[PDB]
Amino acid sequence: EPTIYEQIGGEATFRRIVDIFYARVEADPRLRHLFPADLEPGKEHQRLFLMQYFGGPRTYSERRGHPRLRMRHAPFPIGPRERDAWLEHMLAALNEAGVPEPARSVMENYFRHAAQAMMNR
Amino acid sequence: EPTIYEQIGGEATFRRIVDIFYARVEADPRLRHLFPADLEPGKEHQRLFLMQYFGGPRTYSERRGHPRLRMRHAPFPIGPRERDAWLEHMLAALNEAGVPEPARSVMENYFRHAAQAMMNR
Numbered sequence: 001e002p003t004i005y006e007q008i009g010g011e012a013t014f015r016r017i018v019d020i021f022y023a024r025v026e027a028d029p030r031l032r033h034l035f036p037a038d039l040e041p042g043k044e045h046q047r048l049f050l051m052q053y054f055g056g057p058r059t060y061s062e063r064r065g066h067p068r069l070r071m072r073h074a075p076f077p078i079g080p081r082e083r084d085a086w087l088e089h090m091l092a093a094l095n096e097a098g099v100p101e102p103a104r105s106v107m108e109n110y111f112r113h114a115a116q117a118m119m120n121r
Numbered sequence: 122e123p124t125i126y127e128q129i130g131g132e133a134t135f136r137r138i139v140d141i142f143y144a145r146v147e148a149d150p151r152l153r154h155l156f157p158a159d160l161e162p163g164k165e166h167q168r169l170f171l172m173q174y175f176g177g178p179r180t181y182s183e184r185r186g187h188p189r190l191r192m193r194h195a196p197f198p199i200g201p202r203e204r205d206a207w208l209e210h211m212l213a214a215l216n217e218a219g220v221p222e223p224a225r226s227v228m229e230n231y232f233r234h235a236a237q238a239m240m241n242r
């Protein structure tokens with residue numbers, strides 16, 4: 001059976017999601033300060049991670065090793081404020097990119113869980 | 122063409138914007154300390170400025186002369202953190218006050234530039 005990666009149109013669709021997400025992050029003074037001056041490497045890492053998580057190429061683990069996202073987010077103070085902002089933008093990206101059901105629901109479910117689990121304050 | 126002021130509903134809309142903005146300022150320790158004990162005179166001055174800038178009455182100039190905003194903000198140490206806090210609350214105020222597009226975007230564009238250019242430390 002098709003992976004979600006396949007269900008939603010593969011790499012091109014993840015590119016679109018991450019583009020919308022990062023545009024919103026860049027424009028959000030609640031969040032911009034946490035990110036580097038050069039956003040591009042992180043934007044690439046996020047695209048590759050999502051592609052991998054949802055059944056696509058394992059390019060992410062080739063570049064970056066194990067995700068260990070909770071450890072990677074430890075340097076950023078993340079409370080409900082940051083969580084809510086992040087989720088707002090990623091769900092808007094999902095919805096704006098036209099991801100079809102049922103995959104869109106799986107992705108939302110994952111993000112709601114993962115955003116909560118990333119909080120550290 | 123009609124002014125932004127007219128497009129967004131005039132004085133009444135700016136009152137809503139500034140009320141929401143100042144409520145947020147008062148509740149934000151990043152900013153509150155910069156403002157005087159009595160916020161009301163400055164609140165009215167800010168409302169009149171916005172009204173004038175976006176094409177409404179020239180009441181601001183009658184009361185305060187030229188805006189000279191960078192000069193007037195010199196007494197306040199304003200860096201990236203203060204910029205970010207101000208912009209967060211003003212952008213939220215535009216959204217919560219119901220400012221329609223495309224006018225809202227013009228106002229956002231102006232604020233993003235002005236907030237950056239106000240920094241002095």
Ligand code: HEM
Nearest residue numbers: 034035036042045046049064078082083086111114115118
């Ligand atoms: C579902 C929740 C989240 C997921 C799936 C996610 C995913 C990722 C991934 C894959 C990376 C790149 C890791 C790497 O360097 O290989 C990353 C980095 C980052 N994330 Fe998240 N994240 C989430 C939540 C958050 C939240 C809540 C915040 C802050 C509000 C945040 C801010 C950051 C920042 C600042 C970076 C560093 C970016 C860079 O190095 O350029 N993330 N995230």
Ligand code: HEM
Nearest residue numbers: 155156157163164166167170185203204207232235236239
């Ligand atoms: C787009 C950026 C900004 C605009 C358009 C703006 C506009 C104004 C205006 C029109 C006034 C009243 C001027 C007068 O006295 O006649 C004012 C005062 C003031 N502004 Fe701003 N401002 C901006 C950025 C900031 C920032 C970044 C801060 C601090 C983070 C700040 C803090 C203050 C304070 C403390 C006052 C004095 C208020 C009072 O005297 O009651 N402003 N601003």
